[PDB]
Structure 1
């Protein structure tokens, strides 16, 4: 890899870990550091601390299930993941402590609404807690992008798993 020519992207789920990773790349002389995150706060912090490129998720929803037993969180999530996959979604799973984060992309608003209703009902049936839902709205995305630009972002990038869906939300 070329520290001068290649873009090195930090995929960040926590602000402090993000800052440490950007610092490592800076101290290695990386000239093009990007930060990719679903958390606008992380992208806002990166902008101030040497993130040259801020990578935003376009139109993705995140559902977070919280509970003490990971097997039960996953058991509860399986039916919703099954439906999401059948609707054409891409699903990303990660663990933040006792939280199971389920990011769902590649689906339109009415499908995101259905999946959030499913998550709510599954959490009740399985006795777990939903601590985050939704978040794919395009208007919110553009507002947040504008905040990044006005704070001084050097370069914005937007990632989507289905620009056919995203162009329909942006056409108006």
Structure 2
């Protein structure tokens, strides 16, 4: 089970103060965190947490709300069984080769009933593939290595 939390406030010092406390509590309960600050909005994505601590982390969210005077919202995903996550990175000085490799890597993951999230910035293209089991994450890694030699691009992948 995972948990998505959003913090909003005009005081950056207050947001980051709340960030420090929230991620500590989540890690205190053996949870892997991921965060992203953009403007006055702070996203905190916590994974590997069951119903027990998700009740506590939510209570911590309400507590930091009143403490630092900021807005807070969250969503909870409990049911299963699954799945998994995968982050692939493409790099190269040829934009056409990257986007062409992107189209193929997308086709593969979506053929195997997986949801993809990609981001192109400069010469780097990052792909997040969620909703896939270990049986699939090994196959996509092979296809990622095929694209590596085919379009001569730098490729890195990490599984969690």
Query: What is residue 158 of structure 2 aligned with on the other side?
Result: 134
Matched, 1:26 2:8: no
Q: Which protein has the larger Cα radius of gyration, Structure 1 or Structure 2? A: 2
Q: Residues 118-133 of structure 1 correspond to what in structure 2 (within 5 A)?
A: 118-130=143-155, 132-133=156-157
The change in CA–CA distance for 1:57 and 1:119 in structure 2 (over 3 A counts) is farther
Matched, 1:8 2:38: no
CA contact (8 A) 1:64 1:133 kept: yes
TM-score of the pair, normalised by structure 1: 0.49
TM-score of the pair, normalised by structure 2: 0.53
Question: Following the alignment from structure 1 to structure 2, what is the Cα–Cα distance between the partners of residues 67 and 119?
Answer: 14
Per-residue deviation, 1:67 = 0.2
Query: What is residue 109 of structure 2 aligned with on the other side?
Result: 84
* Bigger strand share: 2
The change in CA–CA distance for 1:57 and 1:74 in structure 2 (over 3 A counts) is farther
Query: What is residue 87 of structure 2 aligned with on the other side?
Result: 62
The change in CA–CA distance for 1:109 and 1:25 in structure 2 (over 3 A counts) is farther
CA contact (8 A) 2:86 2:158 kept: yes
Name structure 2 gaps, 5 residues minimum: 24-31, 49-83
CA contact (8 A) 2:118 2:126 kept: yes
Per-residue deviation, 1:120 = 0.6
Question: Following the alignment from structure 1 to structure 2, what is the Cα–Cα distance between the partners of residues 25 and 92?
Answer: 29
Query: What is residue 74 of structure 1 aligned with on the other side?
Result: 99
CA contact (8 A) 1:65 1:100 kept: yes
Per-residue deviation, 1:69 = 2.0
Count residues with an aligned counterpart.
Answer: 107
The change in CA–CA distance for 1:87 and 1:57 in structure 2 (over 3 A counts) is farther
Name structure 1 gaps, 5 residues minimum: 1-6, 10-21, 47-51, 137-172
